[PDB]
Ligand binder design. Structure first.
Ligand code: NI
Length: 341
């Protein structure tokens, strides 16, 4: 049974609600992004209307085989009528194809559902500037002040400089980057660009990247592993045993691996600056954990909410424990008293 924080009151609509069977009264199912916890339940046998971005729609058709007649892509930044209700999709600054959804209810209430997002000051100049929001359904993944991490640009700067130094000292070093979902593609694209290489990967991953509308993608990626000195591997293989085993397969072309694991936040964020990050090393293998986040930091979250001034907040993440729920409610009230709404 579908929980309350996935229903949009006063509509036939749900958000990210595909794992509950047929939801009573739902006439349109929205999907914010192609991450498995959110699409859980969709398949080629789904027969209700799905509303989403163009990129999410490419992934539903090619990767999950949802039939074309049930896929309803909408353009971004554009007022659209769905089943008699005005909606807008906005870029969420999460993974490719990820949106926030603005719903203009028949009774005059305006609701924003962030999906998963990384808040940014640029959102203060979208179509959000123009009107008031009564209810905010908020991605609260990192809603606590201990959750700090650098900008995505500082993290990519660290990765490009690290990779370029290593491979210039040793032209026989291979770079490997872990992946387990869409998102964080700038990590491996930026490193391959500095090295003058395409990125090599499995057929299954190539297929996924081909759905993403990335400009000039055919110039950037390949399934010919032999031609490439940046390889992608599943995140599970990014350990000393998995990397040893990979280096065997490369036909004595390489004698060193430098590998990257993009994580979200880890507690080594509470002590170490990005500049000071060091790898784990065993022999000719080194592994860097780099804190490349596609969710808001606590400060970015608080800035966004203090600017939007919603009348009510419904968290969508960390909702399973009383301690989490109480912590999040306390910070919402601080924010409101500090800013005066
Ligand atoms: Ni996500």
């Amino acid at each position: 049974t579908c929980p309350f924080y996935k229903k949009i009151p006063g509509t036939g609509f749900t958000v990210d609600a595909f794992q509950y069977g047929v939801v009573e009264g739902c006439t349109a199912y929205f999907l914010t992004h192609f991450h498995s916890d959110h699409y859980a339940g969709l398949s080629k046998h789904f027969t209700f209307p799905v509303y989403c971005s163009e990129i999410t729609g490419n992934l539903l058709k090619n990767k999950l085989h949802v039939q074309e007649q049930y896929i309803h892509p909408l353009p971004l930044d554009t007022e659209c009528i769905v089943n008699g209700v005005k909606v807008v999709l906005l870029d969420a600054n999460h993974c490719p194809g990820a949106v926030m959804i603005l719903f203009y209810l028949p009774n005059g209430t305006v609701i924003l559902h962030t999906g998963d997002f990384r808040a940014d000051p640029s959102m203060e100049r979208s179509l959000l500037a123009d009107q008031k929001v009564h209810m905010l359904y908020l991605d609260t993944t990192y809603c606590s002040p201990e959750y700090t991490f650098p900008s995505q640009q500082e993290v990519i700067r660290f990765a490009i400089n690290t990779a370029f130094e290593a491979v210039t000292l040793n032209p026989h070093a291979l770079v490997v980057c872990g992946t387990y979902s869409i998102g964080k593609e700038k990590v491996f694209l930026a490193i391959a660009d500095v090295l003058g290489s395409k990125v090599g990967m499995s057929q299954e991953k190539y297929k996924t990247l081909q759905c993403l509308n990335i400009p000039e993608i055919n110039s950037l990626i390949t399934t010919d592993m032999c031609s490439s000195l940046v390889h992608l591997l599943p995140m599970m293989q990014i350990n000393f045993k998995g990397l040893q085993s990979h280096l065997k397969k490369c036909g004595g072309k390489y004698n060193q691996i430098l590998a990257f694991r993009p994580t979200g936040w880890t507690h080594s964020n509470k002590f170490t600056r990005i500049a000071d990050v060091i790898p784990q090393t065993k022999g000719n293998i080194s592994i860097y954990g780099i804190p490349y986040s596609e969710h808001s930091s606590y400060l970015e979250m608080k800035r966004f909410v203090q600017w939007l001034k919603p009348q009510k907040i419904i968290p969508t993440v960390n909702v399973g424990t009383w301690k989490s729920r109480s912590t999040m409610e306390k910070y919402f009230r601080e924010w409101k008293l500090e800013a005066g709404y």
